[PDB]
Design a protein around this nucleic acid. Structure first.
Lengths: 212, 347, 257, 127, 191
RNA sequence: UUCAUCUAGACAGCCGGACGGUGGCCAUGGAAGUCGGAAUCCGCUAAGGAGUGUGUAACAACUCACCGGCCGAAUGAACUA
RNA sequence: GCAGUCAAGCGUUCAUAGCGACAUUGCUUUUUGAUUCUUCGAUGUCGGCUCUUCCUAUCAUACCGAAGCAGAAUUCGGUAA
């Protein structure tokens, strides 16, 4: 649709940065990009990133950069910036956030399951402060969450408090879905970026987890 | 204990009434050859026509009037329930649209016997049938409109109760969203399962009890009754009001437990609006949870119906709690005994 | 439908519905009442500026009402502006002057009462005083052919109406009585427009001439030939200086003193 | 963290809409009277009711910004009358009489361009 | 467009190989040994590298075209039905009154004798096909095990067992005693 | 036969994501996108149109798409006989 | 009875200059100031008893299926003489 977009900002930077993102979101992602007035994050693609840079030795414009585009076959993205390395690297190691993350991953912490009337608040919060589940979400737990429930005079309840999620355990397509119903964060999203690239130096330097 | 409702069967509006269409169809259909001679095969379709006639004839226009009383029967409260549904509008539109299609059958029979004339040319008959079909169509159109309304309120009367004002009745009403889960539900066994209810937050929880050999039971309409008629440009609040107007023994409900600091000062000057209306109506005040009453609003709220200060005839009040099951039988008993020594004793 | 638009916002304040047929004309009076003529053969009065609700339905005309006129019509079109050409300093003054002008035209027996005339293809015209009453003041008959257009003078004293019958007829605006015919047109007379000075009326006709007639004298003041073809529209300026015309010939001709 | 209402006007009698969960320890009462004095100027907007309370501390933290300080900025003591009532009898009001409010409205820090709030005077104030 | 061949790479592990002759497929497995007859689709298999299967399927302009996928799914049901199996963990979620369900034995058919079913005194002797064991509740209240070694011998009878209490007037919302399938899992927990 | 899209990841089946100012105005009987009317404004982006469900008396929960990851081979809908 | 939307043909060439069928969706009760015998006071006055056979546009009984199907009662459709 838009076809071209990267070539709109070619000769306006000099210190192009590449960031590596694990669990991508939005309300916790626009807390850094919106803060700076010159750091646009590009997450989603992987081949459009080197449009104004080049992926080959005949379709590039700079030296020692085509080898970097080959390592862009993951969940990483670029960053439209031109600041100092030290003033942007330290900032990445000071931002933490806990969320639900993605399923199929051995997540820590232990969540207990209450017995009786179900709620939608949490586990550490007492039942005297919790809120009863409304009469709407019923067939979504009799097949998707495969949880044995037992209705009692209108109000839907359960039978035995069988634990299905704990520290060091992975499930399927309902691991990070049963935590969303209550409101308990699982894993903690930590900023773990990759390396970078300078036009003036024409060199690369693997940092953090990218260090081989 | 009934009136004159929930006896009328189902009524097909317009979409479920496609029968006329089917009939007109078979009609225009015909095409017979008539046995005997091939030169005298012109005599038969007259019978055809008489047939169609009788058909639409019986049709409807009499089953609609059944199930509905009169616009001026006895008490206006019997028609007040319809005001919060179809409104005197569709009301008259009740018997109104009634007589409407009603005479409709008139025009019907009319044109009917009308064509009736001739019993030659089955073809001409097809045209006649088509005309009849068109006529029928131009009717049930606007028909089914309000008729849709019809079917609606129709089924409607299955959840709405209907008491009898021609006997003893104890008006019992309470205020939800406080703690009636283990208080008001200790009398009856009403619970929301499938049947829904708008207006208020809860549904219809009418209490009932059978002491000795008497019969005391009445529903409650919270919301509209707890506010003046002028404030409600319609809705049911007014519903609450007429609801009241009905009764024999109105029982007001209070709560001095202070759930979140919801004391009464503005609704004090509201009981006088229905005070002269209670010519032969006994009153009773029941306060839930009477033990945690702090001396901060007690020396001001007591000058309402508790003590002999304002708008009080001089009745007996009760201060207890049915939630802790403390003499719940005594409270229920001492709230209808006054009616026995009033209307029953005199009449 | 007639749609009322808030000009600044381009918002639709009200959609006046209820007419069964096309709404051919609309005028908006000083009282804040909208008057319309429609193909449904009705003339309707609406409380427009206000609720946007329909107050009156007058069924009186036999055929489609194509044109209507207010006794105030000219004054309201111009607002505050008159022959002097003075424009007031502030917005308040502009409104006050416009209201003052409106009152002068509208007052009969010293009281504001806007009058309305409507014209039908039936050749019938009804003179109405809607504020005072639903009953028409009078029915004006006499035209041989259709009344295409009707106009009150700016003062609202008299009415000149253009008719197809080759005459434009004069009527007393108050009572509706028939004064006289202005013969002179050979062919159908399409429209009439009154001068700001209220002495004259200009018409444009099929005969391809414009005729300014001194209504008071009831004599033809000036005949202005020049159009090759039929003249459809005529207008007389607020300042009074020029009359404009346009029509089948496609060329505008402006006429001056 | 939790919000709760009742009837239009914290008086009534017992026909309120307060189920359970009492804010600020036990027996709120005075808690509900704290939000009544946290309306800054005069009351008006009361649509989708809100009530924010911190950990064991009933304080005020509800700033409508462009929901309550807009109607009172039209030099009109009451509220909206009928439909599309921009200002009092004008159309193009002074932009400097609203740019001072948008300056303070930046504690969220989610946007970037300052010229966004004042740019909505025809598609917001006139709608 | 009348395809000449639509070969599909069928992944078949060792130990559970099948016998290929005409249109009959053999089910080899330690957990029960059953057979299956196919005389309505006319298929043909060809061995070239044990695991994978490369054949030639003609007629591609009617309803055939890819008549291998409709068989491949049936093949997996015979492989994962003899190894992983098909345990339909159906839960009896019902209130009303404690139904006394007693399954008796008769000619090795095990007719389910339902006594007092929601006020009904009718003995519905539902026929049970061989090749599936049916137990009762042990640790979890109301649970029946439908662990079988086939699909058309377990799921086929389960559909008739569910629609055996059909009522003319009453349906499903009259009482929450309807027998629904909770989760169509397998016998093996790891697979 | 006539045509979008079609190696800077087409078109399905899944996962992940679906964000603010702002609780936008008349009706509190209920109504924080989800029975009408007045209607289709900005900023921040790889992407985010006041909107076709489920219905506790109102959110988060479930159902989903211009544009992605994975998969890597043809093609989404409307006609003519 | 009249009046729209969709527009397949025709208009030497071209869907909307002039025209425009077969459906569906409204209003209205005037077959176009009703061309010389027309919209009417007129019920075809040819059927019944007993006995045999057959069909479906299926009122009832049996077996499925609607709906705010609570129970009960009532109404409708399809497959069957």
């Amino acid at each position: 649709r838009i076809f071209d977009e990267v070539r709109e900002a070619l000769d306006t930077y000099r210190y192009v940065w590449v960031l590596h993102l694990d669990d991508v979101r939005t309300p916790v992602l626009q807390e850094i990009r919106t803060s700076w007035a010159g750091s646009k994050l590009i997450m989603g693609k992987r081949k459009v990133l080197q449009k104004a840079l080049g992926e080959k030795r005949e379709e590039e414009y700079k030296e020692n950069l085509y080898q970097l585009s080959k390592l862009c076959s993951g969940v990483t993205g670029l960053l439209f910036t031109d600041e100092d390395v030290n003033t942007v690297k330290e900032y990445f190691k000071s931002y933490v956030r806990s969320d639900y993350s993605r399923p199929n991953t051995k997540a820590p912490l232990t969540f207990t399951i209450p017995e009786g009337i179900v709620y939608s608040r949490g586990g550490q919060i007492p039942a005297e402060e919790d809120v009863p589940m409304i009469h709407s979400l019923e067939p979504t737990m009799r097949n998707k969450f495969e949880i044995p429930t037992k209705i009692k005079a209108g109000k839907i309840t359960i039978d035995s408090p069988y634990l299905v999620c704990t520290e060091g355990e992975k499930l399927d397509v309902r691991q990070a879905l049963i935590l969303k119903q209550f409101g308990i964060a699982a894993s903690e999203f930590k900023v773990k970026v990759s390396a970078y690239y300078d036009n003036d130096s024409s060199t690369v330097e693997s940092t953090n987890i990218n260090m081989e | 204990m009934q009136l004159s409702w929930k006896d009328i069967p189902t009524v097909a509006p317009a979409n479920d009434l496609l029968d006329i269409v089917l009939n007109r169809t078979q009609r225009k259909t015909p095409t017979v050859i008539r046995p005997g001679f091939k030169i005298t095969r012109i005599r038969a379709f007259y019978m055809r026509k008489v047939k169609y006639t009788g058909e639409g004839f019986v049709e409807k226009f009499e089953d609609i009037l059944k199930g509905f009383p009169n616009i001026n029967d006895v008490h206006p409260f019997h028609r007040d329930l319809m005001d919060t549904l179809y409104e005197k509008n569709h009301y008259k539109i009740s018997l109104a649209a009634i007589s409407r299609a009603k005479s409709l059958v008139e025009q019907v029979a009319r044109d009917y016997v009308r064509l009736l004339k001739f019993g030659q040319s089955l073809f001409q008959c097809k045209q006649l049938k088509r005309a009849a079909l068109g006529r029928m169509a131009t009717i049930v159109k606007k028909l089914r409109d309000p008729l849709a309304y019809l079917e609606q309120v129709r089924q409607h009367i299955g959840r709405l109760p209907s008491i009898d004002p021609n006997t003893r009745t104890l008006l019992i009403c309470g205020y939800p969203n406080v703690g009636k889960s283990s208080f008001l539900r200790c009398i009856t066994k009403s619970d929301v399962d499938v049947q829904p209810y708008a207006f208020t937050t809860k549904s219809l929880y009418v209490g009932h009890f059978d002491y000795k050999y008497l019969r005391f039971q009445a529903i409650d309409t919270p919301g509209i009754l707890d506010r003046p008629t002028e404030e409600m440009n319609n809705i049911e609040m007014q519903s609450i009001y007429a609801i009241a107007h009905l009764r024999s023994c109105v029982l007001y409900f209070m709560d001095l437990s202070e759930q979140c600091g919801f004391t009464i000062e503005a609704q004090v000057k509201l009981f006088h609006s229905i005070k002269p209306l209670f010519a032969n109506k006994s009153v009773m005040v029941v306060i839930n949870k009477t033990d945690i009453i702090r001396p901060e609003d007690l020396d001001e709220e007591r000058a309402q119906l508790l003590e002999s200060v304002k708008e009080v005839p001089g009745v007996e009040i009760m201060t207890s709690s049915c939630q802790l099951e403390e003499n719940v039988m005594e409270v229920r008993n001492k709230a209808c005994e006054k009616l026995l020594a009033s209307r029953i004793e005199n009449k | 439908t007639i749609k009322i638009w808030d000009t600044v916002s381009r918002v639709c304040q009200y959609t006046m519905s209820g007419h069964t047929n096309s709404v051919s004309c609309v005028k908006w009076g000083g009282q804040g009442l909208l008057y319309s003529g429609s193909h449904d053969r009705t003339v309707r009065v609406w409380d427009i500026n206000s609720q946007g609700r329909c107050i009156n339905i007058l069924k009186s005309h036999a055929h489609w009402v194509n044109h209507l006129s207010l006794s105030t019509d000219y004054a309201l079109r111009i607002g505050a502006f008159d022959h002097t050409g003075k424009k007031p300093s502030t917005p308040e003054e502009a409104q006050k002057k416009a209201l003052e002008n409106y009152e002068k035209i509208c007052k009969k027996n010293g009281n504001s009462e806007e009058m309305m005339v409507t014209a039908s293809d039936d050749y019938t015209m009804f003179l109405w005083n809607p504020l005072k009453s639903t009953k028409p003041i009078a029915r004006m008959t006499g035209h041989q052919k259709l009344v295409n257009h009707v106009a009150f003078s700016p003062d609202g004293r008299y009415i000149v109406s253009a008719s197809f019958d080759n005459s434009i007829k004069l009527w007393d605006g108050r009572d509706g009585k028939f004064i006289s015919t202005f013969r002179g047109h050979v062919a159908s007379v399409y429209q009439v427009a009154w001068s700001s000075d209220c002495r004259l009326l200009v018409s444009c006709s099929k005969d391809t001439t414009l005729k300014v007639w001194d209504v008071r004298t009831r004599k033809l003041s000036v005949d202005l030939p020049g159009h090759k073809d039929e003249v459809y529209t005529v207008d007389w300026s607020v300042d009074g200086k020029r009359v404009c015309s346009g029509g089948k010939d496609k060329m505008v001709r402006l006429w001056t003193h | 963290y939790l919000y709760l209402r009742a009837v239009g006007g914290e008086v009534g009698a017992s026909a309120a809409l307060a189920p359970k969960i009492g804010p600020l320890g036990l027996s709120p009462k005075k808690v509900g009277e704290d939000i009544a004095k946290a309306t800054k100027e005069f009351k008006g907007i009361k649509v989708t009711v809100q009530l924010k309370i911190q950990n064991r501390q009933a304080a005020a933290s509800v700033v409508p910004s462009a929901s309550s300080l807009v109607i009172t900025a039209l030099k009109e003591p009451p509220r909206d009358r009928k439909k599309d009532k921009n200002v009092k009898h004008s159309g193009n009001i002074q932009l400097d009489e609203i740019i001072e409010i948008a300056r303070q409205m930046r504690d969220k820090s989610f946007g970037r361009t300052l010229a966004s709030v004042t740019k909505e005077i025809l598609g917001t104030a006139q709608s | 467009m009348k395809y000449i061949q639509t070969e599909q790479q069928i992944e078949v592990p060792e130990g559970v190989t099948v016998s290929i002759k005409s249109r009959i497929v053999k089910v080899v497995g330690p957990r029960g040994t059953l057979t299956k007859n196919l005389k309505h689709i006319d298929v043909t298999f060809t061995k070239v590298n044990n695991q994978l299967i490369k054949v030639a399927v003609h007629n591609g302009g009617r309803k055939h075209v890819a008549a291998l996928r409709t068989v491949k799914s049936l093949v997996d049901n015979m492989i994962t039905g003899v190894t992983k199996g098909y345990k339909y963990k159906m839960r009896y979620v019902y209130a009303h009154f404690p139904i006394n369900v007693n399954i008796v034995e008769k000619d090795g058919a095990k007719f389910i004798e339902v006594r007092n079913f929601l006020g009904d005194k009718k003995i519905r002797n539902v026929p049970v096909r061989d090749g599936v064991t049916i137990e009762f509740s042990t640790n979890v209240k109301d649970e029946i095990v439908l662990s079988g070694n086939s699909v058309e011998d377990v799921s086929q009878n389960a559909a008739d067992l569910q629609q055996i209490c059909r009522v003319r007037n009453k349906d499903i919302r009259k009482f929450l005693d309807g027998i629904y399938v909770s989760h169509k899992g397998f016998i093996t927990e790891d697979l």
